[PDB]
Design a binder for these strands. Structure first.
Ligand SMILES: *[C@@H]1O[C@H](CO)[C@@H](O[C@@H]2O[C@H](CO)[C@@H](O)[C@H](O)[C@H]2NC(C)=O)[C@H](O)[C@H]1NC(C)=O
Ligand SMILES: *[C@@H]1O[C@H](CO)[C@@H](O[C@@H]2O[C@H](CO)[C@@H](O)[C@H](O)[C@H]2NC(C)=O)[C@H](O)[C@H]1NC(C)=O
Ligand SMILES: *[C@@H]1O[C@H](CO)[C@@H](O[C@@H]2O[C@H](CO)[C@@H](O)[C@H](O)[C@H]2NC(C)=O)[C@H](O)[C@H]1NC(C)=O
Ligand SMILES: *[C@@H]1O[C@H](CO)[C@@H](O[C@@H]2O[C@H](CO)[C@@H](O)[C@H](O)[C@H]2NC(C)=O)[C@H](O)[C@H]1NC(C)=O
Ligand SMILES: Nc1nc(=O)c2ncn([C@@H]3O[C@H](CO)[C@H]4OP(=O)(O)O[C@H]43)c2[nH]1
Ligand SMILES: Nc1nc(=O)c2ncn([C@@H]3O[C@H](CO)[C@H]4OP(=O)(O)O[C@H]43)c2[nH]1
Ligand SMILES: *[C@@H]1O[C@H](CO)[C@@H](O)[C@H](O)[C@H]1NC(C)=O
Ligand SMILES: *[C@@H]1O[C@H](CO)[C@@H](O)[C@H](O)[C@H]1NC(C)=O
Ligand SMILES: *[C@@H]1O[C@H](CO)[C@@H](O)[C@H](O)[C@H]1NC(C)=O
Ligand SMILES: *[C@@H]1O[C@H](CO)[C@@H](O)[C@H](O)[C@H]1NC(C)=O
Ligand SMILES: *[C@@H]1O[C@H](CO)[C@@H](O)[C@H](O)[C@H]1NC(C)=O
Ligand SMILES: *[C@@H]1O[C@H](CO)[C@@H](O)[C@H](O)[C@H]1NC(C)=O
Ligand SMILES: *[C@@H]1O[C@H](CO)[C@@H](O)[C@H](O)[C@H]1NC(C)=O
Ligand SMILES: *[C@@H]1O[C@H](CO)[C@@H](O)[C@H](O)[C@H]1NC(C)=O
Ligand SMILES: *[C@@H]1O[C@H](CO)[C@@H](O)[C@H](O)[C@H]1NC(C)=O
Ligand SMILES: *[C@@H]1O[C@H](CO)[C@@H](O)[C@H](O)[C@H]1NC(C)=O
Ligand SMILES: *[C@@H]1O[C@H](CO)[C@@H](O)[C@H](O)[C@H]1NC(C)=O
Lengths: 777, 773
RNA sequence: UUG
RNA sequence: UUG
């Protein structure tokens, strides 16, 4: 097909509509900007390389650049790899950017720069210098940024990237940047709010600094400000996972009552970790539009019981009062002020880490009439007692979250969220059952025993999360009787005792059941387990039974008219299917609608004959990955007449079938990565017209000849993976080298990991760049 | 040193006292008996190879052989590898053994043999033909075994190795084997006890067969028999993990009341899985010496409550009545007959799988006066209730085992349910004193009074319960003598630094696999709880996912071993955060620290300085370590063992001696090392063990590996590298061929990878004369 | 690779 | 390899 092979070690994309030529050289172990970058290049990304300098020659030809992303070519020592530390800061020579008349966005984050780079074109809207070593801002260094709208300067002086002094900002440094919308000075050891800021700011980020006091006029002119973040100034340091220095005398960040008076447009106020003890209502006198308020990680335990300020927040969407508990105090109950009832717009309330013994219905009465309330998060509260029936008054909610408690008789937050330093930190790369309906999340509690009356009045629930409790009982179909509407039960990380084949049958509308990581009782010999419990679940679509160490079953067959997906990863089918024992060879046969089966990680070093014949007739998607498979009778695929995806990754296979078409007419996706294949059979893919995806990566293949890979098949492939093999680039490889260079077929990692290993001369050389003319003399 | 390199791909060992020359060729991927086997060879082992034939030429020179072990050179299809199936049964030519005048023991197990091999010498005392295809025994084929004392014939016809007929034994086939002591016909599809057996038998194994009936005279003459095993005839098949066919009519193995009358010497009787419903006392009328009786996997639930037969067993040491429960019956309690009191010699009583709701003190009264009772096993009984205090009447016992029950206020894990627990392959806190094992119960909450009257306990096993409480040092008050607590696989909440402090005599604490509360942010954990445990020697806190700690230091005057595998020291030691760099410093007598599997891709500076002063043994394995500042080992002045296995290191120190003068054992296996530094081992005289296996080393020169060091090494591991066998390698190849230093796998995995000619060739066999022209 |  |  192609007349001119692509040798450039970067992905090139065309977006004809937006007039964009996108060149992505992310993480290509470059020590130089590569030659041959298209002249029409608009967006060039060189992040995570080791290019030690920029010069007028760097971008000479590239006069149409709108965006240069040159991040993380010299990451500060403690932020970067300890195996490849950058020896000297990036050097930017004069005039490197002044010729780029159309340049809108420049990212120079993570390059150990000492100063704001000069000579930047007046087109620039966005400049980013995070994770550098710039800790003095002078008005004179900013005159070049007349048109700048977005300026990121954070992470230039903090514990991971120290500068060993206070940050310095000259008076009025930013004032004459008349179009500046977004200013970020986070994580920078700043001691005062810099003034005067231009009145065009929409977003101001001042968090994780050393600001002890806000002056009453610090935000006087910012009548367009929408987002203000002052978090992590006078931090609450208890159990902090980073070095944390509090303000002296347990002082809060001191905020005058009239500090916010000019912020009539403010939508987001973030006061996380400011050691606040009071929230004066006078703060919010002139902010009628505030939508999001974060007051997490303070000392507002008393204030939550008073909270006059809430009367001024009728448009608030999101309130977070998490982790406000008094140290070494365990309150008897949660005292929510009546003032919460005035939060007419509230969709999301989070109050983790209040820390109290007993939740009772009346304590939530202030919320009964919040019509728009969607999420109530009372996680990580060490609640010992809670009658779940109280949530009958909360049918309108999408999520009731009691995760991480001590109870016994629409996006999830990262596992580190309230305690991390900077949850918005940008990486060097880049720049759940809620969907089923009403969710009650009781995960990570101390529930040892359940009975029907625990769920009295909760028939509206679509999802119940019981993950990570202590449930050890012989469920018999009597325990969830009220849960008539339940579509999803997550029962993972309990100790299910499957003595009874009637377990879960009362959940007549159950579509998905997760009983993964319930291995306990499956580890002891002589215990009766009824894997045939599936028969009674008439609308079950998906069953997850992973990591259960299942090596025995009293019943011989699982049956279902409905089940489409079975995850059975991390069990011991090798023990059930011991060579000579026929009894379990039809375990899955009567799952008549099953399409997806995952039996990876079952220590299946071989498959006894009868396994494939025993498969249910409509199996589409089979994983046998990570089994230590040392042999495989390819012909047995003939029994799986609807097989579309076969995953055999991470095994010990040494051969492919002589003729894949003769094994399976239906197979579309063949994953063979991470095996021990050293050669392909002569006619491997001959007439395999249905094949669309083939992964032969991370094998030991030396040679590939034309006969194995006919062109009428290769042309149908959406992707062919060949990387990390042992290719021999001798004159015997002429066809393969030619074909790789010239094909239109998508083959990933040509630039990094489709490499000759030999002979001598060409060792470590990309096959895409290989010249074999000496073979044609 | 050596003048003649050892090229034979087998270990050769000398035992001068017994005049033995031991040649072990186990698992050497041989397809031929190797040449050059010493002429003086007495014991030759060729197990797990693919040698397709034996012939007169096989052992011609080896006239002094006493033992040939030639097992598993052609394993039956379903018993063997499916990746290397044996194509044709072993072929044994005539006269292969008749020249071996001194041959005492021949093992030919696992070779797909169809017949008993003939032409065996009259010296033979032991013949073994397990896992063959010999399923008809003819008197004529046994005449050659006049002097045989031990004959193994089992596993020749069973579900893993089927013969598709009944086993056949001709009448009196064994009678004229006048010195036969041990006969094993297990796992063979035998239908009747073969008769007449010789009266010299000490041991008869007939288990896992199809014997429905014992005739009254089957064992008439066996007045020397010590062990009889008839188990697995009319099996109890409930929840069996193998294909199991019961006797028709739910029948037991039928044993007439006088069948054992002649067995005056019997010490062991095994009647496991015989579907017995009754144990007639008349069985044991003439056996006063029986010591071991296994009656597990029967239907003797009612019989346990009666059990008149026990009155005839005053010398019994070991009784097993495990897995005798009636299907779908969950008894209220355990009914032990008063007859148990007559078992004056009993050391070990096992009654798992009785299956009952509540154990009460009175129910064990029949045992109160068994003076020698050492082990009481009531595991896998689904007991819901048991007052632990009842065991105050049992201080004399070594182990009280309530493992796998349902209580709430060592045998292989498969034992009672496996087919043949004595099958031959081709190739714990009891020690501390009184042990109460409550592992795998449903204990959610504990308090001091649960342990009332149990102050004598030395080991308590609470492993695999549901304990989720903030232990505060009040919960084990009575357990004043406890030396070992296994608290693994619970949900310890380490809120309180006073946890466990009441166990004033605790030497070992295991709180491994208590990760639960360590997985959620904002929870207070006090790792400094070690301070209060004044005699603690060993602390195991593996697989706890520990990534946060309210306290900054662990302290102990006593602790010698800390296992901290499978945690998140990488998070505690984030580059820039100094606060936890002395976590272990104040464990002043610590000698062994295991911080493998802590995702430590690098070690921040200060880690080594923060190590306690007497550290001898440090594991940093399986951390994905990509770099390592070897010079920092200077801080570990007492370091003897450094384990850096399974990492991504690419280099060794320029000079190991300049890093550590104390280091004896350096484990670097499974890294990415491609070359050694020029002077690597110069003057590191006290180095004794070096493992460089599974790396990418191409060349090793004498400067890196001076001989004044290498010769002192007890072991040097080099296998699975990328050795380039050019003329540059002359020294290394010479030294490897000639050294006395132990180097494992020379015969199998110390290989050239090039150039061309020598690719895949063993370094030990490499001829490099062309380099010396 | 006699489980 | 800014968490
Ligand atoms: C190419 O560069 C331009 C400008 O740097 C990018 O345009 C930005 O796109 C994002 C989309 O998330 C918008 O939010 C910004 O407001 C745009 N800025 C400008 C000045 O146009 C464009 O995204 C880049 N394209 C690629 C593929 O990287
Ligand atoms: C933030 O600035 C403070 C000073 O305002 C820095 O603290 C100084 O650090 C040097 C070296 O650590 C010391 O000699 C001085 O004693 C410190 N002064 C004070 C007042 O504490 C601090 O290092 C800066 N933080 C970072 C991470 O760079
Ligand atoms: C070498 O072969 C002899 C002969 O088979 C072995 O000696 C026997 O070892 C068994 C195993 O415990 C003893 O119980 C016998 O009493 C020994 N004597 C005889 C004559 O059988 C000897 O152990 C073998 N040595 C090795 C290391 O394999
Ligand atoms: C043990 O012997 C029995 C016969 O007593 C074998 O069973 C016969 O096997 C063939 C083939 O499976 C059948 O056609 C016969 O009907 C069987 N006879 C009976 C009486 O069942 C059995 O296969 C043998 N067991 C093993 C493991 O080899
Ligand atoms: N798994 C299980 N959990 C129990 O709680 C139980 N109680 C009695 N039993 C009996 O023990 C036998 C082995 O588990 C089971 O078989 P059963 O005779 O039907 O009755 C069962 C229990 N089994
Ligand atoms: N780990 C733990 N387990 C508990 O059961 C508990 N109850 C209250 N608390 C309090 O919650 C805080 C966060 O773990 C702890 O700090 P405290 O305020 O000293 O008291 C503790 C508990 N902590
Ligand atoms: C709740 O707390 C506030 C503290 O401001 C207190 O004034 C109020 O009376 C408390 N109410 C209850 C029900 O405890
Ligand atoms: C839980 O509250 C409900 C009413 O919502 C009531 O029916 C039930 O009895 C309560 N249960 C307990 C144990 O308090
Ligand atoms: C249930 O909770 C666990 C633990 O919090 C979480 O990992 C899991 O994703 C949740 N399950 C669903 C279905 O959302
Ligand atoms: C299930 O268990 C409950 C426990 O109270 C019992 O009422 C019910 O009868 C049991 N179900 C069956 C099928 O026995
Ligand atoms: C499951 O199998 C058992 C036999 O082991 C049978 O008695 C029980 O009724 C079966 N249950 C279903 C739903 O098939
Ligand atoms: C096959 O199943 C796996 C999970 O087992 C899934 O990730 C994958 O997308 C499926 N493939 C197709 C083609 O549906
Ligand atoms: C495989 O190959 C042979 C020859 O084309 C043919 O006879 C046989 O039917 C084929 N089987 C399948 C399932 O394609
Ligand atoms: C357990 O037995 C002891 C006597 O050994 C007694 O002191 C205690 O009260 C008993 N516990 C219960 C709950 O009956
Ligand atoms: C405690 O019981 C567990 C679970 O059976 C067992 O694995 C462990 O080895 C026992 N602990 C000790 C210290 O022997
Ligand atoms: C620990 O908790 C116990 C049991 O609830 C409590 O009564 C006691 O005061 C505490 N003990 C110690 C040693 O602090
Ligand atoms: C452990 O550390 C905490 C504070 O971090 C302290 O309150 C406690 O007393 C310490 N305990 C011991 C035993 O050192």
């Amino acid at each position: 097909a192609r007349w001119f092979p692509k040798t450039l070690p970067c992905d090139v994309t065309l977006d004809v509509s937006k007039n964009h030529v996108i060149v992505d050289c992310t993480d290509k172990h470059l020590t130089e900007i590569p030659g041959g970058i298209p002249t029409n290049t608009t967006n060039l990304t060189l992040t995570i390389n080791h290019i030690p300098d920029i010069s007028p020659a760097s971008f000479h030809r590239l006069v149409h650049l709108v965006e240069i992303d040159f991040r993380c070519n010299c990451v500060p020592i403690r932020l970067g790899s300890k195996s490849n530390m950058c020896p000297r800061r990036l050097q930017i020579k004069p005039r490197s950017f002044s010729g780029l008349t159309y340049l809108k966005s420049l990212y120079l984050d993570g390059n150990q720069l000492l100063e704001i780079p000069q000579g930047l074109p007046p087109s620039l809207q966005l400049l980013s210098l995070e994770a550098n070593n710039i800790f003095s801002i002078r008005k004179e260094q900013l005159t070049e940024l007349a048109n700048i709208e977005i300026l990121y300067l954070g992470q230039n002086c903090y514990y991971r990237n120290p500068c060993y002094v206070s940050y310095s900002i000259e008076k009025d440094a930013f004032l004459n940047l008349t179009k500046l919308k977004v200013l970020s000075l986070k994580d920078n050891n700043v001691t005062t709010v810099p003034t005067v800021l231009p009145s065009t700011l929409t977003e101001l980020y001042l968090y994780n600094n050393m600001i002890a006091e806000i002056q009453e006029d610090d935000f006087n002119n910012l009548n367009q400000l929408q987002i203000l973040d002052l978090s992590g100034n006078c931090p609450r340091c208890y159990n902090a996972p980073f070095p944390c220095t509090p303000c002296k005398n347990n002082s809060p960040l001191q905020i005058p009552v009239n500090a916010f008076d000019a912020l009539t447009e403010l939508k987001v106020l973030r006061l996380h970790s400011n050691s606040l003890q009071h929230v004066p209502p006078r703060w919010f006198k002139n902010i009628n539009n505030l939508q999001e308020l974060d007051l997490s990680q303070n000392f507002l335990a008393k204030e939550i019981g008073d909270a006059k300020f809430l009367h001024f927040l009728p448009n608030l969407i999101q309130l977070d009062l998490s982790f406000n508990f008094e140290l070494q105090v365990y309150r008897a109950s949660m005292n929510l002020s009546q003032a919460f009832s005035s939060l007419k717009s509230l969709k999301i309330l989070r109050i983790r880490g209040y820390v109290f013994k007993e939740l009772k219905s009346f304590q939530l009465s202030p919320l009964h009439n919040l019509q728009n309330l969607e999420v109530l998060d009372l996680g990580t509260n060490f609640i010992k007692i809670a009658n779940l029936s109280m949530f009958k008054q909360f049918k309108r909610l999408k999520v009731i979250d009691l995760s991480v408690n001590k109870i016994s008789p629409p996006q999830v937050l990262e596992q580190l969220y309230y305690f991390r330093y900077d949850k918005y930190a940008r990486s060097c790369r880049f720049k759940s059952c809620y969907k089923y309906g009403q969710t009650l999340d009781l995960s990570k509690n101390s529930i040892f025993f359940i009975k029907s009356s625990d769920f009295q009045h909760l028939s509206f629930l679509k999802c119940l999360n019981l993950s990570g409790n202590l449930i050890s009982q012989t469920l018999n179909g009597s325990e969830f009787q009220p849960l008539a509407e339940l579509r999803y039960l997550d029962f993972s990380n309990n100790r299910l005792d499957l003595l009874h084949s009637t377990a879960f049958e009362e959940l007549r509308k159950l579509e998905v059941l997760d009983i993964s990581s319930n291995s306990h009782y499956f580890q002891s010999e002589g215990i009766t387990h009824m894997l045939n419990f599936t028969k009674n679940l008439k609308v079950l679509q998906k069953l997850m039974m992973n990591d259960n160490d299942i090596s025995s079953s009293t019943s011989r067959t699982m049956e279902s008219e409905s089940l489409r997906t079975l995850e059975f990863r991390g069990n011991h089918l090798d023990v059930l299917w011991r060579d000579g024992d026929n009894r379990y060879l039809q375990l899955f046969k009567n799952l008549l609608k099953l399409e997806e089966l995952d039996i990876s990680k079952n220590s299946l070093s071989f498959l006894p004959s009868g396994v494939f014949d025993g498969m249910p007739p409509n199996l589409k998607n089979l994983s046998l990955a990570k089994n230590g498979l040392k042999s495989f009778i390819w012909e047995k695929l003939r029994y799986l007449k609807n097989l579309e995806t076969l995953d055999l990754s991470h095994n010990q296979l040494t051969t492919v079938p002589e003729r894949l078409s003769n094994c399976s007419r239906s197979l579309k996706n063949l994953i063979l990565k991470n095996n021990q294949i050293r050669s392909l059979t002569k006619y491997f893919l001959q007439d395999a017209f249905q094949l669309r995806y083939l992964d032969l990566s991370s094998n030991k293949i030396q040679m590939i000849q034309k006969t194995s890979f006919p062109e009428n098949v290769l042309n149908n492939l959406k992707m062919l993976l060949l990387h990390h093999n042992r290719f021999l680039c001798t004159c015997d490889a002429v066809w393969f080298v030619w074909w790789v260079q010239h094909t239109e077929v998508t083959i990933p990692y040509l630039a990094t990991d489709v490499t000759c290993v030999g002979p001598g001369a060409h060792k470590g050389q990309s096959v895409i760049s290989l010249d074999l003319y000496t073979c044609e003399l």
